Amino acid sequence: KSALSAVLMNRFGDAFFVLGLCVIAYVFGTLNYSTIFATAYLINTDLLVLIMLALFIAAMAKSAQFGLHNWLTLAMEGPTPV
Amino acid sequence: SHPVPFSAANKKLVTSMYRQSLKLARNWISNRQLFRQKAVEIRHKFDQNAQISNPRLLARTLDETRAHLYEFRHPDPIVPPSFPGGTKYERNVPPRMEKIMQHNLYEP
Amino acid sequence: VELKPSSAIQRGPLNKGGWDAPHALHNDGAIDRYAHWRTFYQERFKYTRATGKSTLIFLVAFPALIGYVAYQSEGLFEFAGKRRGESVTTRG
Amino acid sequence: KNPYKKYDDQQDRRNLEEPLSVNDDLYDMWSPDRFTHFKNQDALKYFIGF
Amino acid sequence: SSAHVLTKDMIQERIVALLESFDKVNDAKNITATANLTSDLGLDSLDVVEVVMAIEEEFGLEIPDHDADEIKTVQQAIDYVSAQPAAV
Amino acid sequence: LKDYYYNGRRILDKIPVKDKQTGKVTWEIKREGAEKEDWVNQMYFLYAPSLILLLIVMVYKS
Ligand SMILES: CCCCCCCCCCCCCCCCCC(=O)OC[C@H](COP(=O)(O)OCCN)OC(=O)CCCCCCCCCCCCCCCCC
Numbered sequence: 001k002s003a004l005s006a007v008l009m010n011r012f013g014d015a016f017f018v019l020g021l022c023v024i025a026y027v028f029g030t031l032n033y034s035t036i037f038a039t040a041y042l043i044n045t046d047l048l049v050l051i052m053l054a055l056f057i058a059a060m061a062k063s064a065q066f067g068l069h070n071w072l073t074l075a076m077e078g079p080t081p082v
Numbered sequence: 083s084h085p086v087p088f089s090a091a092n093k094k095l096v097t098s099m100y101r102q103s104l105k106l107a108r109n110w111i112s113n114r115q116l117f118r119q120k121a122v123e124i125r126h127k128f129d130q131n132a133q134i135s136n137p138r139l140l141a142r143t144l145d146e147t148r149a150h151l152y153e154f155r156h157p158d159p160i161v162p163p164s165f166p167g168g169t170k171y172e173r174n175v176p177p178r179m180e181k182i183m184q185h186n187l188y189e190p
Numbered sequence: 191v192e193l194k195p196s197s198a199i200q201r202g203p204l205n206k207g208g209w210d211a212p213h214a215l216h217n218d219g220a221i222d223r224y225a226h227w228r229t230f231y232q233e234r235f236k237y238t239r240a241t242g243k244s245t246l247i248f249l250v251a252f253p254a255l256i257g258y259v260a261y262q263s264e265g266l267f268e269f270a271g272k273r274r275g276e277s278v279t280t281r282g
Numbered sequence: 283k284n285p286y287k288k289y290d291d292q293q294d295r296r297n298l299e300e301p302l303s304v305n306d307d308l309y310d311m312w313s314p315d316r317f318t319h320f321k322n323q324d325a326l327k328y329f330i331g332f
Numbered sequence: 333s334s335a336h337v338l339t340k341d342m343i344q345e346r347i348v349a350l351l352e353s354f355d356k357v358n359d360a361k362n363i364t365a366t367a368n369l370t371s372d373l374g375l376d377s378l379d380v381v382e383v384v385m386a387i388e389e390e391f392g393l394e395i396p397d398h399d400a401d402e403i404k405t406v407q408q409a410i411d412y413v414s415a416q417p418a419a420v
Numbered sequence: 421l422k423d424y425y426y427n428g429r430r431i432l433d434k435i436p437v438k439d440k441q442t443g444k445v446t447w448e449i450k451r452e453g454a455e456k457e458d459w460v461n462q463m464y465f466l467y468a469p470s471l472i473l474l475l476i477v478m479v480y481k482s
């Protein structure tokens with residue numbers, strides 16, 4: 001059950017991550033770091049806000065901040081080295 | 083109701099309440115000295131009211147114990163690892179040794 | 191004449207001929223009933239004040255809200271390559 | 283349910299011919315965990331108050 | 333690593349020691365496998381509870397009521413602790 | 421013969437193997453080979469190679 005909780009918080013973040021990927025590719029037309037970072041100083045802040053909010057929500061899931069730290073303590077049900 | 087003061091059912095009951103109170107002390111308290119102090123105080127609180135004969139006051143006292151035990155519940159009780167609420171319960175279950183029943187006449 | 195089937199027809203039992211395999215399931219009798227019920231719920235479903243709540247929610251309100259969202263936001267956003275100060279909308 | 287009792291299916295804590303509720307998928311062990319310490323309303327009070 | 337195993341004699345040695353350290357016992361040299369708790373050793377109906385709680389902490393167990401109230405003998409407790417693979 | 425062979429193969433859990441020299445076959449336990457299914461010669465030699473041909477062709481049409 002802890003495994004299911006961990007992987008379903010993962011997808012609760014990954015969904016927004018794909019939303020960010022879809023937005024990055026609508027805006028910049030690409031996904032690679034070089035182009036996106038050579039241009040990001042020209043594109044509307046509302047668009048970067050939408051992008052970074054989604055990527056951050058994914059990072060909130062994996063990095064287990066207060067909203068989605070549920071899985072982390074449950075993930076101790078495995079072996080210690082894990 | 084009729085909770086008789088000198089019968090086996092009340093004995094089972096009060097023994098369970100005493101076990102529960104001791105485990106609650108052991109879970110709440112960290113140090114050992116204070117655990118023994120609280121244990122002795124509880125045994126005193128029990129022996130003080132082992133003598134009652136009226137069923138009414140007896141049952142009122144049992145209700146007060148129920149409320150007290152509900153009021154000092156512990157959310158993360160100490161339990162052994164290899165027993166149900168523990169970290170090592172059904173870790174490596176020896177699989178039941180069973181023989182291959184067959185389902186089809188041509189396939190393994 | 192007594193009207194009965196022809197005696198030239200020689201009849202016999204139906205042997206599908208499967209090899210009767212051993213019992214690899216232990217039927218439980220209550221799980222099966224729970225499944226029969228959850229499977230044929232449709233033939234007993236009745237309209238009441240909760241069924242009606244769920245039905246009208248999921249078949250009136252949410253579809254209507256999603257459609258209002260769509261038919262407002264139809265040709266609105268268009269923000270491929272947009273830049274600072276430029277509007278992302280095509281309308282007001 | 284008491285874990286120390288001997289059930290046929292010790293993991294799910296179910297006996298063989300035990301009747302099932304219509305919403306048993308919510309009330310088995312694979313279902314989400316219940317918490318018995320705080321009643322959920324006071325829990326919501328405490329979470330949002332913090 | 334943890335190369336350790338339990339034995340009926342060892343469980344008996346630990347249980348009698350646990351009972352020899354108990355002040356509310358009648359007196360020593362009544363304690364044996366055939367010792368009763370309420371009759372021989374002379375214990376209340378709560379000292380039996382304290383003794384069972386003590387056997388739990390000693391051998392690392394969790395003995396419920398329906399298995400505890402039936403312990404009215406030391407050999408019974410020995411056979412019980414021998415009937416838990418995790419008896420430490 | 422099909423029915424007898426297979427009912428015995430399941431029940432006894434043996435196959436009948438006549439060894440080289442003695443003209444007397446009996447049920448035996450050896451099953452590590454010498455048994456093939458009727459669907460292998462078709463698939464592994466007509467389907468799979470055609471799938472591999474399909475892969476090669478998709479790659480070199482790309
Ligand atoms: C009401 C309609 C909803 C429609 C939209 C969908 C909304 C989100 C999805 C919720 C829908 C219900 C999901 C039900 C799945 C339950 C599956 C299941 O049975 O597994 C239970 C599992 C928890 O397992 P558990 O029993 O707790 O075991 C722990 C003991 N070791 O369960 C889990 O692990 C949970 C998996 C889901 C995790 C979702 C976490 C959401 C938390 C959001 C917090 C707010 C964060 C801010 C987000 C920003 C948004 C702008």
Ligand SMILES: CCCCCCCCCCCCO[C@H]1O[C@H](CO)[C@@H](O[C@H]2O[C@@H](CO)[C@H](O)[C@H](O)[C@@H]2O)[C@H](O)[C@H]1O
Nearest residue numbers: 237241242243244245246247248249250251252253254
């Ligand atoms: C829970 C079950 C109960 C709820 C069931 C809900 C089902 C929907 C029923 C309500 C239908 C109302 O439908 C309503 O829409 C049409 C247009 O769409 C309205 O009619 C309108 O049509 C437009 C053309 O689209 C005309 O140019 C005109 O402007 C008019 O105002 C009517 O005022 C009415 O027919």
